[PDB]
């Protein structure tokens, strides 16, 4: 479901690293990654938002944020 | 349930069948399947038909 690069189409799609938590246990990462140590590092950064999101997914709906 | 195809596992539909065997009393019924072979001829043999 994720879109790890800008597509093979010349496709108009906001290219900005981010981590999505749509709900129902569906986690997607949207970024346009190039082969660089810069995007090797922000891949580790954006996966960290996902592993934080996968952990508190057993709480009720209104408590699924960070603690502050 | 609003089921969607892009739903993480644990949110996708599972079909369930619960078999419940309940005994009671009778003279006989279903049971295991017996095995067999290929009977011969013209040879003292030990047979079960």
UniProtKB/Swiss-Prot annotation, chain A:
Effect of residue 30 to K/A: No effect on interaction with SARS-CoV spike glycoprotein
Effect noted on mutating residue 54 to A: Slightly inhibits interaction with SARS-CoV spike glycoprotein
Region Interaction with SARS-CoV spike glycoprotein: start-end pairs: 24-28
Outcome of swapping residue 60 to A: Slightly inhibits interaction with SARS-CoV spike glycoprotein
Effect in UniProt of substituting residue 64 to A: Slightly inhibits interaction with SARS-CoV spike glycoprotein
Tissue: Expressed in endothelial cells from small and large arteries, and in arterial smooth muscle cells (at protein level). Expressed in enterocytes of the small intestine, Leydig cells and Sertoli cells (at protein level). Expressed in the renal proximal tubule and the small intestine (at protein level). Expressed in heart, kidney, testis, and gastrointestinal system (at protein level). In lung, expressed at low levels in some alveolar type 2 cells, the expression seems to be individual-specific (at protein level). Expressed in nasal epithelial cells (at protein level).
Outcome reported for the amino acid change (mutating residue 26 to A): Strongly inhibits interaction with SARS-CoV spike glycoprotein
Domain of life: Eukaryota
UniProt-annotated binding residues for Zn(2+): 45, 49
Induction: Up-regulated in failing heart. Expression is induced by IFNA and IFNG. Exposure to cigarette smoke increases expression in lungs. Expression is decreased in nasal and bronchial epithelium of individuals with allergy after allergen challenge. IL13 stimulation decreases expression in nasal and bronchial epithelium.
Biotechnology: An engeneered stable, dimeric and secreted receptor with combined mutations that increase the affinity for human coronavirus SARS-CoV-2 spike protein shows potent SARS-CoV and SARS-CoV-2 neutralization in vitro.
Disulphides: 15-32
Residues annotated for substrate binding in this entry: 16-17
PTM comment text: Proteolytic cleavage by ADAM17 generates a secreted form. Also cleaved by serine proteases: TMPRSS2, TMPRSS11D and HPN/TMPRSS1. Phosphorylated.
Localization per Swiss-Prot or TrEMBL: Cell membrane; Cytoplasm; Cell projection, Cilium; Apical cell membrane
Task performed by this protein: Essential counter-regulatory carboxypeptidase of the renin-angiotensin hormone system that is a critical regulator of blood volume, systemic vascular resistance, and thus cardiovascular homeostasis. Converts angiotensin I to angiotensin 1-9, a nine-amino acid peptide with anti-hypertrophic effects in cardiomyocytes, and angiotensin II to angiotensin 1-7, which then acts as a beneficial vasodilator and anti-proliferation agent, counterbalancing the actions of the vasoconstrictor angiotensin II. (Microbial infection) Acts as a receptor for human coronaviruses SARS-CoV and SARS-CoV-2, as well as human coronavirus NL63/HCoV-NL63.
UniProt similarity note: Belongs to the peptidase M2 family.
Full protein name: Angiotensin-converting enzyme 2
Species the sequence originates in: Homo sapiens (Human)
Boundaries of the shown chain within the full protein: 330 to 397 of 805
UniProtKB/Swiss-Prot annotation, chain B:
Effect of residue 7 to Y: In strain: Alpha/B.1.1.7, Beta/B.1.351, Gamma/P.1, Theta/P.3, Mu/B.1.621, 19B/501Y, Omicron/BA.1, Omicron/BA.2, Omicron/BA.2.12.1, Omicron/BA.2.75, Omicron/BA.4, Omicron/BA.5, Omicron/BQ.1.1, Omicron/XBB.1.5, Omicron/EG.5.1; May enhance affinity to human ACE2 receptor
Species name: Severe acute respiratory syndrome coronavirus 2
Effect of substituting residue 7 to Y: Increased binding affinity to human ACE2
Assembly with partners or alone: Binds to host ACE2. RBD also interacts with the N-linked glycan on 'Asn-90' of ACE2. Cleavage of S generates a polybasic C-terminal sequence on S1 that binds to host Neuropilin-1 (NRP1) and Neuropilin-2 (NRP2) receptors. Interacts with host integrin alpha-5/beta-1 (ITGA5:ITGB1) and with ACE2 in complex with integrin alpha-5/beta-1 (ITGA5:ITGB1). May interact via cytoplasmic c-terminus with M protein. May interact (via N-terminus) with host bilirubin and biliverdin, thereby preventing antibody binding to the SARS-CoV-2 spike NTD via an allosteric mechanism.
Region: Disordered, residue numbers: 25-47
Full-sequence range covered: 495 to 543 of 1273
Its job: Attaches the virion to the cell membrane by interacting with host receptor, initiating the infection. The major receptor is host ACE2. When S2/S2' has been cleaved, binding to the receptor triggers direct fusion at the cell membrane. When S2/S2' has not been cleaved, binding to the receptor results in internalization of the virus by endocytosis using host TFRC and GRM2 and leading to fusion of the virion membrane with the host endosomal membrane. Alternatively, may use NRP1/NRP2 and integrin as entry receptors.
Domain of life: Viruses
Protein name: Spike protein S1
Impact noted for substituting residue 2 to S: In strain: Omicron/BA.1
């Amino acid at each position: 479901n994720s879109m790890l690069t800008d597509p093979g189409n010349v496709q108009k799609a906001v290219c900005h690293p981010t981590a999505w938590d749509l709900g129902k246990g569906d986690f997607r990462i949207l970024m346009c990654t190039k082969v660089t140590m810069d995007d090797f590092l922000t891949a580790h950064h954006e996966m960290g938002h996902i592993q934080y999101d996968m952990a508190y997914a057993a709480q009720p709906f209104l408590l699924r944020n960070g603690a502050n | 349930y609003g089921f969607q195809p892009t739903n993480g596992v644990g949110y996708q539909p599972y079909r369930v069948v619960v078999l419940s065997f309940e005994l009671l009393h009778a003279p006989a019924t279903v049971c295991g399947p017996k095995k067999s072979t290929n009977l011969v001829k013209n040879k003292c043999v030990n047979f079960n038909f």
